[PDB]
């Protein structure tokens with residue numbers, strides 16, 4: 001008759017009596033736990049069992065024997081399959097990896113387009129509300145200020161107020177530079193008057209031509225500035241911004 | 244015009260001035276300067292007190308030549324000082340502090356009295372008016388929270404339910420690990436039956452009592468048994484007579 005699923009027609013109406021098997025054991029064992037309990041006593045002992053149990057414990061070792069030599073041999077033909085099918089699954093999963101794109105783009109869209117949806121109002125609902133907290137900073141800092149400025153001074157010494165000249169004992173030294181400082185200040189004193197005596201004579205030579213030896217060095221340096229120099233001196237500048 | 248002179252060091256970008264200036268006129272200025280120097284007094288006095296500056300840079304490095312080399316000796320003693328000082332500076336200090344402690348009282352009462360005088364009413368508006376800011380937050384823990392919650396599923400997974408069954412191209416593993424346990428668990432399940440049929444029989448050798456105690460419990464296990472052949476097929480021979 002009929003294959004696994006499609007031809008289910010009358011395979012099976014006489015199915016539901018195969019549960020009536022299991023079911024109606026419990027319709028009847030209810031009447032039949034009554035009469036075993038009625039006779040319960042014995043003459044047993046704790047000796048006769050240990051013949052049975054000693055043999056029955058032997059009857060683990062014997063058929064463990066060959067079964068132990070079985071599910072070893074059996075699982076290399078899984079692992080030898082596995083270590084060759086290793087190369088097949090690495091191309092099998094690739095043939096699923098790239099086709100999925102529509103799904104992981106829809107998940108990207110359900111994460112990225114629905115990330116900005118929350119932040120786009122929240123940026124403004126923080127900025128427009130934080131003006132009441134800009135006033136919590138702007139009208140806090142300067143009214144601290146007015147006591148904080150005296151709390152920088154109030155607050156620093158008596159200015160070590162002396163009632164007599166002899167209320168420090170102190171001394172001044174520093175010969176470490178002060179001696180070399182006097183020599184660098186006394187070589188300097190002779191330098192700034194040697195480099196004045198030749199200059200004072202070079203100065204006071206020229207109390208007339210001084211305005212016009214200067215002009216003789218302007219005269220032809222002028223006339224070209226309005227002619228040859230004009231395109232050069234129309235730029236003046238450039239500049240900042242790398243070339 | 245534009246900004247006349249140079250913001251920064253600049254060998255490189257000033258080429259846009261240096262080319263065009265030299266091309267038209269930054270040539271001839273040097274030869275009109277040559278004729279400004281060779282005309283009047285004067286061509287001797289650009290030299291006569293130039294090498295007095297050359298020999299001042301020489302006389303600096305050759306005076307600060309034997310006062311280079313021969314000089315960080317006359318001064319060490321001042322800081323052979325300082326290491327003794329900043330280890331013996333004791334005797335000011337444990338006499339200094341004691342009397343000024345008396346005005347340090349009437350300055351904690353400048354610094355801290357005038358602080359809480361502001362710092363209570365500095366926050367007496369916005370400790371109460373924090374409950375304005377909580378309507379800009381507690382009513383916003385829905386778009387910050389209640390659907391950032393639902394994003395725990397939108398990450399993993401925004402359920403892969405299809406709008407029609409015709410969707411996934413799917414097929415079984417099927418081979419290796421599953422057949423390997425179905426055969427060497429299979430035949431071991433059959434010997435678990437044999438070791439049950441053996442080991443559970445060994446115990447009835449030392450059963451008893453009472454002679455009525457056995458023949459009550461037959462019928463529920465024997466009637467479930469009797470209907471079990473209902474299977475039909477409708478073939479009646481099964482081909483596995485393990486059926």
Ligand SMILES: CCCCCCCC/C=C/CCCCCCCC(=O)O[C@@H](COC(=O)CCCCCCCCCCCCCCC)COP(=O)([O-])OCC[N+](C)(C)C
Pocket residue numbers: 034037038040446
């Ligand atoms: C090799 C191994 C083989 C294993 C299978 C061997 C099985 C051997 C036997 C087995 C049969 C069961 C014997 C139970 C005896 C209990 C005493 C009793 O009064 O029984 C009775 C009442 O019992 C009830 O009132 C309780 C319900 C029945 C017992 C169910 C629990 C059993 C486990 C307990 C857990 C204890 C836990 C604490 C342990 C420290 C049952 O008998 P009765 O029909 O009433 O007749 C008595 C006389 N009368 C009618 C005048 C009253």
Ligand SMILES: CCCCCCCC/C=C/CCCCCCCC(=O)O[C@@H](COC(=O)CCCCCCCCCCCCCCC)COP(=O)([O-])OCC[N+](C)(C)C
Pocket residue numbers: 181182184185188
């Ligand atoms: C890589 C190697 C580099 C080496 C570097 C080495 C560096 C070494 C460093 C050396 C500096 C040492 C300190 C000197 C301090 C002098 C103070 C002093 O004597 O004061 C005197 C007055 O004042 C003068 O007589 C002094 C005037 C100083 C002129 C300025 C020199 C500037 C040089 C610029 C160079 C710029 C740097 C150049 C580079 C850009 C005394 O004061 P008084 O007692 O009250 O006077 C009363 C009158 N009475 C004196 C007549 C009685």
Ligand SMILES: CCCCCCCC/C=C/CCCCCCCC(=O)O[C@@H](COC(=O)CCCCCCCCCCCCCCC)COP(=O)([O-])OCC[N+](C)(C)C
Pocket residue numbers: 311312313314315316317
């Ligand atoms: C304004 C900005 C200026 C910047 C440029 C400045 C550049 C300046 C300099 C630049 C370089 C100069 C090099 C000179 C070397 C001389 C070495 C030598 O042998 O000397 C001697 C010590 O020698 C010792 O062993 C001491 C070495 C420690 C020197 C550290 C000094 C730092 C002072 C920092 C202070 C300022 C801190 C800053 C202010 C807070 C030994 O000499 P000698 O063989 O015994 O000689 C013959 C015998 N005789 C001595 C009796 C005659």
Ligand SMILES: CCCCCCCC/C=C/CCCCCCCC(=O)O[C@@H](COC(=O)CCCCCCCCCCCCCCC)COP(=O)([O-])OCC[N+](C)(C)C
Pocket residue numbers: 095096097099100410411412413
């Ligand atoms: C530059 C960096 C680049 C990185 C790229 C990363 C890529 C990441 C991608 C990874 C791919 C993940 C699977 C996505 C779905 C595959 C396609 C599909 O839907 O297949 C099928 C259903 O789905 C299945 O058959 C999949 C079965 C998954 C089993 C559980 C795997 C556990 C992995 C746990 C450990 C994983 C560790 C991962 C670590 C990252 C449906 O069939 P189809 O094939 O669609 O064919 C349809 C017919 N057609 C072909 C004609 C149209």
Ligand SMILES: CCCCCCCC/C=C/CCCCCCCC(=O)O[C@@H](COC(=O)CCCCCCCCCCCCCCC)COP(=O)([O-])OCC[N+](C)(C)C
Pocket residue numbers: 443444445446447448449450451452
């Ligand atoms: C301190 C307590 C120690 C307990 C240790 C227990 C350890 C042991 C575990 C025991 C578990 C028992 C499992 C039995 C399962 C049925 C097996 C079956 O299919 O056939 C059997 C049914 O016969 C029996 O099972 C006999 C039961 C006798 C009970 C005797 C009373 C003992 C009281 C004890 C009170 C204990 C209370 C405590 C319980 C925790 C065999 O059939 P057959 O009769 O051989 O058939 C004859 C023909 N043939 C030979 C051709 C086949």
Ligand SMILES: CCCCCCCC/C=C/CCCCCCCC(=O)O[C@@H](COC(=O)CCCCCCCCCCCCCCC)COP(=O)([O-])OCC[N+](C)(C)C
Pocket residue numbers: 029443460461464465
């Ligand atoms: C927790 C740990 C696990 C324990 C698991 C332990 C359980 C393991 C499970 C075991 C269940 C299976 C047992 C074997 C059944 C064999 C089939 C059969 O009996 O055929 C025989 C029927 O002939 C007989 O009646 C002869 C005597 C055997 C009867 C066995 C009935 C068991 C009733 C048990 C009641 C217990 C109530 C308990 C209530 C709670 C032989 O066929 P035949 O020779 O053609 O028949 C001649 C007669 N004719 C001419 C009429 C046909």
Ligand SMILES: CCCCCCCC/C=C\CCCCCCCC(=O)O[C@@H](COC(=O)CCCCCCCCCCCCCCC)COP(=O)([O-])OCC[N+](C)(C)C
Pocket residue numbers: 387388389391392394395
């Ligand atoms: C980097 C920073 C990440 C931040 C993530 C922040 C996540 C958000 C944080 C917190 C959740 C949002 C705030 C909830 C406030 C309570 C609201 C309410 O009362 O309860 C709510 C439930 O609440 C839950 O369902 C809690 C959800 C926790 C999800 C954590 C996901 C972590 C994802 C990342 C993991 C990465 C792991 C990476 C691998 C290591 C609602 O109650 P209900 O009973 O459910 O609703 C019934 C219907 N009713 C509403 C009509 C009544």
Ligand SMILES: CCCCCCCC/C=C\CCCCCCCC(=O)O[C@@H](COC(=O)CCCCCCCCCCCCCCC)COP(=O)([O-])OCC[N+](C)(C)C
Pocket residue numbers: 413414415416417
């Ligand atoms: C995108 C899905 C991701 C699922 C991932 C789930 C996670 C597990 C990963 C992977 C197993 C995924 C199997 C289900 C595939 C989807 C359903 C399907 O096609 O089932 C079918 C194919 O059945 C199979 O393809 C069976 C695959 C081999 C056995 C299960 C291996 C479990 C690995 C566990 C590894 C971890 C254990 C680690 C322990 C340390 C069968 O069912 P059906 O379709 O109802 O059949 C109707 C008939 N039809 C097929 C003709 C229509």
Ligand SMILES: CCCCCCCC/C=C\CCCCCCCC(=O)O[C@@H](COC(=O)CCCCCCCCCCCCCCC)COP(=O)([O-])OCC[N+](C)(C)C
Pocket residue numbers: 429432433435436483484485
């Ligand atoms: C107290 C609590 C309840 C305990 C209930 C214990 C019940 C114990 C019950 C019975 C004891 C064992 C009986 C074994 C019978 C073997 C013979 C057999 O029928 O073989 C056949 C079927 O083979 C199959 O059906 C294979 C079984 C598949 C695995 C099912 C596991 C269920 C685990 C459930 C785990 C649940 C627990 C989960 C716990 C987390 C194959 O052989 P054949 O091909 O038909 O042979 C004829 C043809 N030939 C000649 C060509 C060969």
Ligand SMILES: CCCCCCCC/C=C\CCCCCCCC(=O)O[C@@H](COC(=O)CCCCCCCCCCCCCCC)COP(=O)([O-])OCC[N+](C)(C)C
Pocket residue numbers: 036447448450451452453456457458
């Ligand atoms: C809350 C749950 C626990 C309830 C506890 C209830 C405890 C009650 C338990 C046990 C009480 C058993 C009382 C009857 C003992 C009679 C002994 C008799 O002589 O037998 C004879 C067999 O013939 C028989 O009829 C064997 C009967 C024992 C079967 C018991 C287990 C089967 C059910 C298992 C159901 C699954 C259990 C699943 C458990 C999860 C002995 O063999 P023989 O061939 O005659 O020997 C040769 C002739 N000669 C003797 C003259 C030399």
Ligand SMILES: CCCCCCCC/C=C\CCCCCCCC(=O)O[C@@H](COC(=O)CCCCCCCCCCCCCCC)COP(=O)([O-])OCC[N+](C)(C)C
Pocket residue numbers: 036456457458459460461464
């Ligand atoms: C997947 C769902 C599984 C559900 C569970 C399935 C359970 C499986 C159900 C049943 C298992 C049955 C196995 C017994 C095999 C016996 C073989 C024997 O030779 O036949 C015997 C049959 O009679 C007895 O064995 C039955 C005795 C009935 C009383 C039982 C009391 C309760 C035992 C409860 C035990 C609790 C212990 C618990 C310990 C852990 C003896 O036959 P006989 O009488 O010589 O025949 C000749 C007749 N004449 C003398 C009249 C001429």
Ligand SMILES: CCCCCCCC/C=C\CCCCCCCC(=O)O[C@H](COC(=O)CCCCCCCCCCCCCCC)COP(=O)([O-])OCC[N+](C)(C)C
Pocket residue numbers: 176177180315316318319320321322323
């Ligand atoms: C912003 C930061 C600023 C920090 C401050 C600057 C850094 C300052 C810190 C250190 C620089 C100097 C290091 C000196 C190393 C000495 C080596 C040695 O073993 O000497 C030892 C002593 O010497 C001491 O124990 C060290 C004391 C040095 C003090 C500083 C002098 C700087 C002078 C700058 C002067 C500029 C002058 C003006 C020039 C125009 C042992 O020597 P001796 O045996 O006792 O005597 C040798 C000679 N005799 C044999 C002839 C007696």
